[PDB]
Amino acid sequence: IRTISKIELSKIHNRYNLTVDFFNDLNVIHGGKSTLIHVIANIVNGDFIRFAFLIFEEIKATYSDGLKIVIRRDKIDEQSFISVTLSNGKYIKFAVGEAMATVRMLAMDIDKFVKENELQKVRASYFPAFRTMLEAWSSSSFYNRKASAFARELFGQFLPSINYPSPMEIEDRLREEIRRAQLGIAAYESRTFSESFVKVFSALFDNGELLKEIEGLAIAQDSSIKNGYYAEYSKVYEEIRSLINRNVENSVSGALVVYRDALRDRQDYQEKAFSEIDNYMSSVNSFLEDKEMAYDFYPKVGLKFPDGSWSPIRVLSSGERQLLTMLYAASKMGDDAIVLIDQPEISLHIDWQEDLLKRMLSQLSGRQIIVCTHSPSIATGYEDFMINISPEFI
Amino acid sequence: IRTISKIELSKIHNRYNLTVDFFNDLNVIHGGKSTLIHVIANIVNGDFIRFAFLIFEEIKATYSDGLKIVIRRDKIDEQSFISVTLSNGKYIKFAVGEAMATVRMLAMDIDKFVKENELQKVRASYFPAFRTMLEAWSSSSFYNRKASAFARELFGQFLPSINYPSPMEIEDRLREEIRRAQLGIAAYESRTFSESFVKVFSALFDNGELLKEIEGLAIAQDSSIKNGYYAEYSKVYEEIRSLINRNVENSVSGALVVYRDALRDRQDYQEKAFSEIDNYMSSVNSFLEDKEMAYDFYPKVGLKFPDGSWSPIRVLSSGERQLLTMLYAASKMGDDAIVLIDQPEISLHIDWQEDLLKRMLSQLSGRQIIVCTHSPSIATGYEDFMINIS
Amino acid sequence: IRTISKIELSKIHNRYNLTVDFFNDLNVIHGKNGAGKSTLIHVIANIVNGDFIRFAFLIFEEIKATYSDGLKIVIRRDKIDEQSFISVTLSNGKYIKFAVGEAMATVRMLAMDIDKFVKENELQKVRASYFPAFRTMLEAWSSRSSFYNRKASAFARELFGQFLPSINYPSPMEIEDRLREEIRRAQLGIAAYESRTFSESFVKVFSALFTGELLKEIEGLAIAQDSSIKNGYYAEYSKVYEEIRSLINRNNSVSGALVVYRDALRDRQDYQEKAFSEIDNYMSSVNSFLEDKEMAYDFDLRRKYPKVGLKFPDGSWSPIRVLSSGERQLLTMLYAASKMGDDAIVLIDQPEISLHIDWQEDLLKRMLSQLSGRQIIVCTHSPSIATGYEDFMINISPEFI
Amino acid sequence: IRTISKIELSKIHNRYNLTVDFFNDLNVIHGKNGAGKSTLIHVIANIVNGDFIRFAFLIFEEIKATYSDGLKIVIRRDKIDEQSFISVTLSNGKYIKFAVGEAMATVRMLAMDIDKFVKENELQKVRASYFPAFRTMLEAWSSRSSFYNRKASAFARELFGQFLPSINYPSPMEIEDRLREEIRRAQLGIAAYESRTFSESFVKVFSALFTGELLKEIEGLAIAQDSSIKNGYYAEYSKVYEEIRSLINRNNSVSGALVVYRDALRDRQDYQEKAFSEIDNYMSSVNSFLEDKEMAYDFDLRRKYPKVGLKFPDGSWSPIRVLSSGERQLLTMLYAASKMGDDAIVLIDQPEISLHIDWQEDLLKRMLSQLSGRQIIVCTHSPSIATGYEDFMINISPEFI
């Protein structure tokens, strides 16, 4: 996909410069740090209208696929203007005073420009440093502008939009994925039934160990949470065993083998369909100890304790909720993006900080991750990927 | 189910006494009627607090199961007190002056009383005379309460809470039912799978017309819109008949019969899963002429015009959204209630007026229907069901 | 005046066409449900008003609009270079091409351009009065006039779509105020006629100076004047007649006095009837529906601003607002077809909301019998509204593409 | 009517007392700044209007209020058990005890209680018109009527304190509109008089039927009628006079015809003067101040609604809004003391804002000469306002605790 490669600031706040070269994979930033992340976030999102609130000269923005974004803010006739220039050369220019009035046609122009040049192909998920209090304030896609406006009023009109997925959205997306996976299993069920019929139909004309294998597969299917709609496999296997014992042709062996293949392929397709959900749930569960997240077959999705009582996701504290959202954002079930985190070391025990980056990389999404940290526990074991930001003060 | 049998209005508005005869089936109120409808809805829905806004003396409501309810607006020391007494002597008293302020604890105690003696087992879908403007206003449970407050400020405090379904609600309910239907079909395939194998396994140990029947079943199954995830029954039939041409044991005949029965039972359960939806859409499409309400598979629920282009349900006129809601409210998938329709003949061409009650009864929901219409065309033919109040 | 002659829609909502030829007097429109009748009335209202800025909210290709005086307004919506535009073109050829996105933004300089265009040309002077199908509930929501209706228009447009024409139908408050002004103008006219008649009567007899049957006739005229509601501020005619009769009885020029009094009384009475013709005809036409009471006016002495309200047989009066919705609808519609209104085209959505069957049988009869000459267009589903008017029925059968 | 007789304040602002005895006709109040005169006028205005909800914003103990007809409204504010309450008590004894916090919350059922109280008793039917001292800037900020003033009241109360009484003083638009209605009412009276005179004239001549000097007198009366602005819709008197004169000249009873016409003309002229007496007296009293132009009216050649505005000696007219604040103040105050208003008590804070010294010398003279009988209360510091009214001067000397 498209990942950021290099950011070249010039005279931000008219006092200091900076020039950073990135890696496509994980990026640990240690050392105006939050300001740098905001600049990166506002470029990748394509929300260029915020850069008429920052004093600078020139900001190059080089991607990995060769794309280039050169923003430039100049003051002519005591009037400020922003001159965004891309790789192909389509320079755009609007007046600053237009932007400030709109906040309290211009926005329509920006989206048409960005869409035409294929610039918003990759989104960016922003995790602010004040998310802990922010979710409490939203206790009560509809919380994407209101909460953003609230945060911008509190911390400044340069703050990028708040896109990070709330736990309610995570639960609903898990539910929809479960529905789609179930439908895929049903389609596979139909195809296997047709295929099994024709198979035996032909080799019928052609003229204990397999029983044990089918018994193992049947009890595995009955011991599978995903089979919450049908668990009669042990019963029908014993009926087949009763049928065999009362009375061996070659076709009978073929019937045995086709049953084993049908069970195994149904099981394997189940694993493939639920691969993403199970990998995400296992990665989360490698941290949690008190309970474990799971599902029940409008199939419920929630936490499950060893006592057997379920609970909604909102019972979780702030520390667990941050872990939930970030690990979701680096999973394949999310949206193709660049994970922009301000401070992950909030309400986290030291053990989870030792392995946070490990789990996020081991999910193997391929998405670019850029973290700015001050703790050495977040960054330990990843010395080769650390980038030190030392801005040159002029 | 529970239905109404007898109401005894005594000196409402101080110059009007009336009693009425009911049945448990369709009772077209032909011909003060509007007031009677409101009094039926407020007793059924358990909203007894609303009676503090009516100048009356005493009303008795008699059900079909023997349950009887008595409301008395007594007067003591220039202050009105509503008393509600059930058949088993369940008396709850409250002053009217206290009630008026709270509307603009008491309601909490009232709903506790309703739930404890279970007076809210059956609700009532009120179809008022102003549905067109209100539904468009909502279109722009939450809709129900909000619109009710707006309505009651417009036409009176004693107006029953508007809770008849809206086309948005109808669309969402249809979508949810399709989702549940897909899950049911999927479960049946799983069941059919394992069971068919053991039948064939038994057929191993047991020692052209059928092919044509299988081919017809495959053609019907493939050409069915309900098969949005597998549609190759014709192809697998071709493979099986090719094997016949290549190659008669009784196990071969057993294989043929098990295939035939599998297809027939799959189709039968497929039909039966889409029964509460297909009956409803067949009733609707019997009225509509240049359009057709259909479904497609994430599922899509919209009108299908003859060119093939679609459109959402919100693009319908003011006289077609009404027909959808009234027909849905008398459907088995609709929530069970004693539907009270006020003037069904609003914005309906006279042909639909003749054929409305016929369809609403032929769906056979087993629900009491009470309509109050000034149009003879609505209730023509049904002279027997007429109940003159006079 | 100006009446519609032919409407030719084309691919409204990109699915169906229609072509209707109208009559100048009355147009009863009946058709199948959902076949686009309310859409047709909305198109007519937005064209005749000249409010062309609403047509950037409806998907079509071309809509011709033909008047009776020869005008041929051709609106056309094209999406040239993937940009939609509306090009309204009149008979003389002044096309006014604007971009659709300008109009939609303006609603939530362009309006001045439209206003300059319509005033310069012959697009106004008609001002089609639209009676919506939800007027019964709409008046409850406003408890508005034919020109103070920005609030009610915005509310209705938000509820039913941004193509909905302005709400022009006269509210009962406006009808009452217009009735007061007409009464005031009629009274001044009676006073002006009184002054001129007094001057003429003086000079006439004075110069030409140098009977039982006529006495009975003058007595009949005097008691008629006393039995006239319009003479509420003066009813002394019987008394003065008896004084003149006493003068005659105690004992040429006397014949001259008799004939001039008869002419003066008859011309004053006839001018009274002519001046109050419109008001009395409208009140009688309304009273042909009402049965419990009757609407009328009072010229009570010792106070001014003469009241207009309902009058019961018991004698107690009541204001117009006492009327229910069913009576109020009759009031407003019959005003719009009366000569007291404004020269317009009466656009009614459903003339049967909150109406008993008896009133539906005779609504069109009274509306036509007022003989205003204004064009009336009703969309009905009941056969009682349209009965006895088979020649004026219009069947809407939209041809599908 | 009801006029104040005696005011006995007690511990206003919890620091000083005062006790003033008033006159029924006119009360000139003179003192110094900080002696609590504007506070006294506010107290009087809020009591007479019956707007008792404002008295939960002033710290006091007891305020007696005495009329001329014997009423003895005693309001009292006590902080019993650390809770403040207002107990207004009238002569008959209907105390209405409410808690202060209810009133303050309501501003930002109580009003219904006040309305029921005032209607049952004899507290309303007065509606004191209050002219604030800051009216000059207030009208400029609003560039309103005596009953459509919620917006202006809230603005003024926010600027000068939550004890400020409602703004009832008639805006010039209301004065102009009331003048139009009064002209209309006068016209209706003329029309009623026209009908009665026509009947009376008939019987008169008819009986007495069975010269140079009188012709000159009738000619003078006829030219006077033609030279009268009130006859803006009938000015044919000269023509008809010449026709009768021509009839006489070409060749007893003729003398009788002359005298009855003269009596008819004189009574018609006198009733015209009587009907327009109030309007002409008010306009003349205003015109005794103005010098650049003069206020008058025009009966147009248009359809109706005769214009009333300023008229300059050049002949060009102008609307009333052309006037500055200084002229506008004279207009409003002189209206409030005129018979054309509503029976009330004229409450003026300072009758010298934006007024030249000459106009201050003669304001009260015109105001008294109108002879309305209404009570006038002015708070002045100039000796020119109070000159010639020594017997009516009131000295405010408050008694500190």
Ligand SMILES: Nc1ncnc2c1ncn2[C@@H]1O[C@H](COP(=O)(O)OP(=O)(O)OP(=O)(O)O)[C@@H](O)[C@H]1O
């Ligand atoms: N936004 C839209 N997009 C597409 N088709 C639409 C849209 N709005 C309306 N239609 C269709 O165009 C026609 C317009 O319906 P309309 O409300 O004008 O019908 P009507 O015959 O006047 O109805 P009724 O007599 O019931 O009041 C209908 O066939 C409707 O389905």
